[PDB]
Enzyme design. Structure first.
Site, PDB file in Angstrom:
ATOM      1  N   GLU A  40      48.433  38.698  34.230  1.00 24.16           N
ATOM      2  CA  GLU A  40      48.803  39.975  34.837  1.00 24.16           C
ATOM      3  C   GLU A  40      49.353  40.948  33.784  1.00 24.16           C
ATOM      4  O   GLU A  40      49.109  42.164  33.846  1.00 24.16           O
ATOM      5  CB  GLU A  40      49.811  39.771  35.987  1.00 24.16           C
ATOM      6  CG  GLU A  40      49.180  39.139  37.208  1.00 24.16           C
ATOM      7  CD  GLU A  40      50.126  38.915  38.365  1.00 24.16           C
ATOM      8  OE1 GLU A  40      51.117  39.657  38.489  1.00 24.16           O
ATOM      9  OE2 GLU A  40      49.847  37.986  39.163  1.00 24.16           O
ATOM     10  N   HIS A  47      45.787  48.916  31.958  1.00 27.60           N
ATOM     11  CA  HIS A  47      46.053  49.939  32.969  1.00 27.60           C
ATOM     12  C   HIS A  47      47.086  50.959  32.489  1.00 27.60           C
ATOM     13  O   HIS A  47      47.067  52.098  32.922  1.00 27.60           O
ATOM     14  CB  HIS A  47      46.432  49.265  34.294  1.00 27.60           C
ATOM     15  CG  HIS A  47      45.255  48.616  34.967  1.00 27.60           C
ATOM     16  ND1 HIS A  47      44.773  49.035  36.185  1.00 27.60           N
ATOM     17  CD2 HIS A  47      44.419  47.624  34.564  1.00 27.60           C
ATOM     18  CE1 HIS A  47      43.697  48.338  36.504  1.00 27.60           C
ATOM     19  NE2 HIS A  47      43.469  47.463  35.544  1.00 27.60           N
ATOM     20  N   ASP A  48      47.951  50.572  31.556  1.00 30.74           N
ATOM     21  CA  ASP A  48      48.817  51.571  30.948  1.00 30.74           C
ATOM     22  C   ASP A  48      48.034  52.400  29.925  1.00 30.74           C
ATOM     23  O   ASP A  48      48.022  53.621  29.959  1.00 30.74           O
ATOM     24  CB  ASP A  48      50.025  50.924  30.258  1.00 30.74           C
ATOM     25  CG  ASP A  48      51.066  51.943  29.843  1.00 30.74           C
ATOM     26  OD1 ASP A  48      51.097  53.024  30.484  1.00 30.74           O
ATOM     27  OD2 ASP A  48      51.820  51.664  28.891  1.00 30.74           O
ATOM     28  N   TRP A 164      34.069  43.587  23.478  1.00 24.39           N
ATOM     29  CA  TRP A 164      35.112  42.790  22.848  1.00 24.39           C
ATOM     30  C   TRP A 164      36.400  42.773  23.685  1.00 24.39           C
ATOM     31  O   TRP A 164      37.057  41.734  23.799  1.00 24.39           O
ATOM     32  CB  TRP A 164      35.415  43.291  21.439  1.00 24.39           C
ATOM     33  CG  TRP A 164      34.200  43.309  20.580  1.00 24.39           C
ATOM     34  CD1 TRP A 164      33.105  42.516  20.683  1.00 24.39           C
ATOM     35  CD2 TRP A 164      33.938  44.201  19.496  1.00 24.39           C
ATOM     36  NE1 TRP A 164      32.178  42.840  19.725  1.00 24.39           N
ATOM     37  CE2 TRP A 164      32.658  43.896  19.007  1.00 24.39           C
ATOM     38  CE3 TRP A 164      34.659  45.240  18.895  1.00 24.39           C
ATOM     39  CZ2 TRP A 164      32.085  44.585  17.952  1.00 24.39           C
ATOM     40  CZ3 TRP A 164      34.086  45.913  17.835  1.00 24.39           C
ATOM     41  CH2 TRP A 164      32.807  45.598  17.395  1.00 24.39           C
ATOM     42  N   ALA A 173      41.815  36.349  36.615  1.00 24.36           N
ATOM     43  CA  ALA A 173      41.366  36.131  37.975  1.00 24.36           C
ATOM     44  C   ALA A 173      41.520  37.419  38.781  1.00 24.36           C
ATOM     45  O   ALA A 173      42.163  38.388  38.360  1.00 24.36           O
ATOM     46  CB  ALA A 173      42.149  34.992  38.588  1.00 24.36           C
ATOM     47  N   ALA A 174      40.941  37.408  39.981  1.00 25.99           N
ATOM     48  CA  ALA A 174      41.001  38.534  40.900  1.00 25.99           C
ATOM     49  C   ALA A 174      41.744  38.145  42.171  1.00 25.99           C
ATOM     50  O   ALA A 174      41.483  37.087  42.773  1.00 25.99           O
ATOM     51  CB  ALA A 174      39.616  38.992  41.285  1.00 25.99           C
ATOM     52  N   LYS A 176      42.373  40.975  44.569  1.00 23.76           N
ATOM     53  CA  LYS A 176      42.078  42.050  45.505  1.00 23.76           C
ATOM     54  C   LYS A 176      40.589  42.336  45.681  1.00 23.76           C
ATOM     55  O   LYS A 176      40.211  42.928  46.686  1.00 23.76           O
ATOM     56  CB  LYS A 176      42.824  43.333  45.111  1.00 23.76           C
ATOM     57  CG  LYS A 176      44.335  43.185  45.046  1.00 23.76           C
ATOM     58  CD  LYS A 176      44.987  42.988  46.388  1.00 23.76           C
ATOM     59  CE  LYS A 176      46.488  42.854  46.214  1.00 23.76           C
ATOM     60  NZ  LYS A 176      47.246  43.240  47.416  1.00 23.76           N
ATOM     61  N   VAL A 177      39.743  41.952  44.723  1.00 23.81           N
ATOM     62  CA  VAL A 177      38.312  42.151  44.892  1.00 23.81           C
ATOM     63  C   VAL A 177      37.811  41.453  46.142  1.00 23.81           C
ATOM     64  O   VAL A 177      37.146  42.064  47.000  1.00 23.81           O
ATOM     65  CB  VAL A 177      37.538  41.682  43.636  1.00 23.81           C
ATOM     66  CG1 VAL A 177      36.061  41.769  43.874  1.00 23.81           C
ATOM     67  CG2 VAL A 177      37.938  42.527  42.464  1.00 23.81           C
ATOM     68  N   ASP A 194      38.267  31.663  25.499  1.00 21.99           N
ATOM     69  CA  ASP A 194      37.027  31.062  25.024  1.00 21.99           C
ATOM     70  C   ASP A 194      35.806  31.866  25.454  1.00 21.99           C
ATOM     71  O   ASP A 194      35.907  32.921  26.084  1.00 21.99           O
ATOM     72  CB  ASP A 194      36.919  29.593  25.453  1.00 21.99           C
ATOM     73  CG  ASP A 194      36.891  29.414  26.954  1.00 21.99           C
ATOM     74  OD1 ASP A 194      36.765  30.431  27.684  1.00 21.99           O
ATOM     75  OD2 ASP A 194      36.972  28.245  27.387  1.00 21.99           O
TER      76      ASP A 194
HETATM   77  C1  HEM Z   1      35.835  47.737  31.223  1.00 18.17           C
HETATM   78  C2  HEM Z   1      36.130  47.917  32.518  1.00 18.17           C
HETATM   79  C3  HEM Z   1      36.975  46.943  33.344  1.00 18.17           C
HETATM   80  C4  HEM Z   1      36.877  46.739  34.685  1.00 18.17           C
HETATM   81  C5  HEM Z   1      35.893  47.479  35.610  1.00 18.17           C
HETATM   82  C6  HEM Z   1      37.804  45.723  35.090  1.00 18.17           C
HETATM   83  C7  HEM Z   1      38.020  45.253  36.360  1.00 18.17           C
HETATM   84  C8  HEM Z   1      38.918  44.291  36.721  1.00 18.17           C
HETATM   85  C9  HEM Z   1      39.151  43.849  38.083  1.00 18.17           C
HETATM   86  C10 HEM Z   1      38.453  44.464  39.316  1.00 18.17           C
HETATM   87  C11 HEM Z   1      40.050  42.867  38.052  1.00 18.17           C
HETATM   88  C12 HEM Z   1      40.628  42.075  39.242  1.00 18.17           C
HETATM   89  C13 HEM Z   1      41.829  42.784  39.879  1.00 18.17           C
HETATM   90  C14 HEM Z   1      42.193  42.108  41.176  1.00 18.17           C
HETATM   91  O1  HEM Z   1      41.483  42.308  42.206  1.00 18.17           O
HETATM   92  O2  HEM Z   1      43.188  41.349  41.201  1.00 18.17           O
HETATM   93  C15 HEM Z   1      40.435  42.646  36.669  1.00 18.17           C
HETATM   94  C16 HEM Z   1      41.345  41.719  36.214  1.00 18.17           C
HETATM   95  C17 HEM Z   1      41.789  41.623  34.902  1.00 18.17           C
HETATM   96  N1  HEM Z   1      41.483  42.491  33.871  1.00 18.17           N
HETATM   97 FE1  HEM Z   1      39.734  43.638  33.815  1.00 18.17          FE
HETATM   98  N2  HEM Z   1      38.487  45.336  33.959  1.00 18.17           N
HETATM   99  C18 HEM Z   1      38.016  46.049  32.873  1.00 18.17           C
HETATM  100  C19 HEM Z   1      38.545  45.967  31.594  1.00 18.17           C
HETATM  101  C20 HEM Z   1      39.628  45.215  31.206  1.00 18.17           C
HETATM  102  C21 HEM Z   1      40.226  45.268  29.905  1.00 18.17           C
HETATM  103  C22 HEM Z   1      39.758  46.229  28.786  1.00 18.17           C
HETATM  104  C23 HEM Z   1      41.215  44.386  29.862  1.00 18.17           C
HETATM  105  C24 HEM Z   1      42.090  44.145  28.623  1.00 18.17           C
HETATM  106  C25 HEM Z   1      43.371  43.816  28.731  1.00 18.17           C
HETATM  107  C26 HEM Z   1      41.284  43.713  31.152  1.00 18.17           C
HETATM  108  C27 HEM Z   1      42.102  42.670  31.513  1.00 18.17           C
HETATM  109  C28 HEM Z   1      42.142  42.055  32.737  1.00 18.17           C
HETATM  110  C29 HEM Z   1      42.831  40.845  32.985  1.00 18.17           C
HETATM  111  C30 HEM Z   1      43.623  39.959  32.045  1.00 18.17           C
HETATM  112  C31 HEM Z   1      42.633  40.564  34.429  1.00 18.17           C
HETATM  113  C32 HEM Z   1      43.189  39.367  35.212  1.00 18.17           C
HETATM  114  C33 HEM Z   1      44.503  39.708  35.923  1.00 18.17           C
HETATM  115  C34 HEM Z   1      44.904  38.574  36.844  1.00 18.17           C
HETATM  116  O3  HEM Z   1      44.589  37.423  36.579  1.00 18.17           O
HETATM  117  O4  HEM Z   1      45.564  38.863  37.898  1.00 18.17           O
HETATM  118  N3  HEM Z   1      40.282  44.261  31.942  1.00 18.17           N
HETATM  119  N4  HEM Z   1      39.719  43.547  35.859  1.00 18.17           N
HETATM  120 CA   LIG Z   2      38.132  31.081  29.618  1.00 20.17          CA
HETATM  121 CA   LIG Z   3      50.022  55.108  30.441  1.00 16.75          CA
END
Ligand code: HEM
Ligand SMILES: [Ca+2]
Ligand SMILES: [Ca+2]
EC number: 1.11.1.16
Length: 329
Positions: A40, A47-48, A164, A173-174, A176-177, A194
């Site tokens: 998270e 998001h920031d 990258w 993980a998700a 809310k999707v 990995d």
């Molecule tokens: C490029 C476009 C991106 C899209 C469309 C996207 C979309 C999403 C979505 C929909 C989720 C799930 C949220 C939920 O329903 O709980 C998610 C989780 C996450 N995103 Fe991505 N994301 C993108 C880029 C990134 C980037 C650049 C990072 C770099 C830090 C990132 C890190 C994460 C991580 C670590 C989670 C898991 C959070 C958890 O386990 O609760 N995302 N992302």
């Molecule tokens: Ca993995």
């Molecule tokens: Ca900001």
């Protein structure tokens, strides 16, 4: 420099981070684990930071998502971000660094707890947030690929840099999707940084792991894994597909490109020459566990080849019948 308790760092301003490191390791990350709070916190860095555009505005990596939480956590693209913002708030208030610095520090520390992880450069000195981010600067999983790539490009990233950064989905993980299956990961190893994410997104879809008809979701290849529409499409788009495939079974590339590009992301809206290098505070990550593989029962015929220059590499499959991915607790 030598800090209060004898630990050392190149630049003495960084000494403030040692008690913060200890506190988040023991009280946010549950004894330096690669689990929910690390995931998270990593999401929060993005998001920031991504709330930055040379023309549309936003201060980038400025802590705005915490300081202006009542505004930003209500943006639809920030669904589910409220939990980690609420968890981090008391830490920011207690310690003596800006909210912007804290978000990026916690993300870097967290990634360093994950097997296979990498040390992300960390700089200190972001000022307090000036204003809330404009809405509509955060990519959504149902946005067109060209729209995601243009938004990321506007913020400063090339198409390959987007790939990258999406190594983050290897520890992710998700909730809310598909709200019927909260904690469903994007790869079969959400506790290991990995290449499984890059492999498993390339497989032909088979099933919905929960309900059908969720916006921003497409079919997954595995029970217990969820596939974002955006990830499905980025794995297949001519701009990104060859780079996506190039990550498969290339742990050093995943590590090095993630570190460099996360550093760039952490500095959106900021000037590296007006900050202090505190990279040496970040701990050493544990070694990679496991090797690159297709899921059990799969073969190369299950891979959707989308890179026009190079065939997907032959990978061995796990032995036995195909099984189910456990959710992140
Ligand atoms: C490029 C476009 C991106 C899209 C469309 C996207 C979309 C999403 C979505 C929909 C989720 C799930 C949220 C939920 O329903 O709980 C998610 C989780 C996450 N995103 Fe991505 N994301 C993108 C880029 C990134 C980037 C650049 C990072 C770099 C830090 C990132 C890190 C994460 C991580 C670590 C989670 C898991 C959070 C958890 O386990 O609760 N995302 N992302
Ligand atoms: Ca993995
Ligand atoms: Ca900001």
């Amino acid at each position: 420099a030598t800090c209060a308790d004898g630990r050392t760092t190149a630049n003495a301003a960084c000494c403030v981070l040692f008690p913060i490191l200890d506190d988040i390791q023991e009280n946010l990350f549950d004894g330096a684990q690669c689990g929910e709070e690390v995931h998270e916190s990593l999401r929060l860095t993005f998001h920031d930071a991504i709330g930055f555009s040379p023309t549309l505005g936003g201060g980038g990596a400025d802590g705005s998502i915490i300081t202006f939480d009542t505004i930003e956590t209500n943006f639809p693209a920030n669904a589910g971000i409220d939990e980690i913002v609420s968890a981090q708030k008391p830490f920011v208030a207690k310690h003596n660094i800006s909210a912007g610095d804290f978000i990026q520090f916690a993300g870097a520390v967290g990634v360093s707890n994950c097997p296979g992880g990498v040390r992300i450069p960390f700089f200190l000195g972001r000022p307090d947030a000036v204003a809330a981010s404009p809405d509509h600067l955060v990519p959504e999983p149902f946005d067109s690929v060209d729209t995601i790539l243009a938004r990321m490009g506007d913020a400063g990233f090339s198409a390959v840099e987007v790939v990258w950064l999406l190594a983050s989905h290897s520890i992710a993980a998700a909730d809310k999707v598909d709200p019927s299956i909260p904690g469903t990961p994007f790869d079969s190893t959400p506790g290991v940084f990995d290449s499984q994410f890059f492999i498993e997104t390339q497989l032909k879809g088979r099933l919905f792991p929960g309900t059908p008809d969720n916006k921003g979701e497409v079919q997954s290849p595995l029970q217990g894994e969820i596939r974002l529409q955006s990830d499905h499409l980025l794995a297949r788009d001519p701009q990104t597909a060859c780079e996506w495939q190039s990550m498969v079974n290339n742990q050093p590339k995943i590590q090095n490109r993630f570190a460099g590009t996360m550093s760039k992301m952490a500095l959106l809206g900021q000037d590296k020459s007006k900050l202090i290098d505190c990279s040496d505070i970040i701990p050493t990550p544990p070694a990679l566990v496991g090797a690159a593989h297709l899921p059990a029962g799969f073969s190369l015929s299950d891979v959707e080849q989308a890179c026009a220059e190079t065939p997907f590499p032959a990978l061995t499959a796990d032995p036995g019948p195909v099984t189910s991915v456990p959710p992140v607790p």
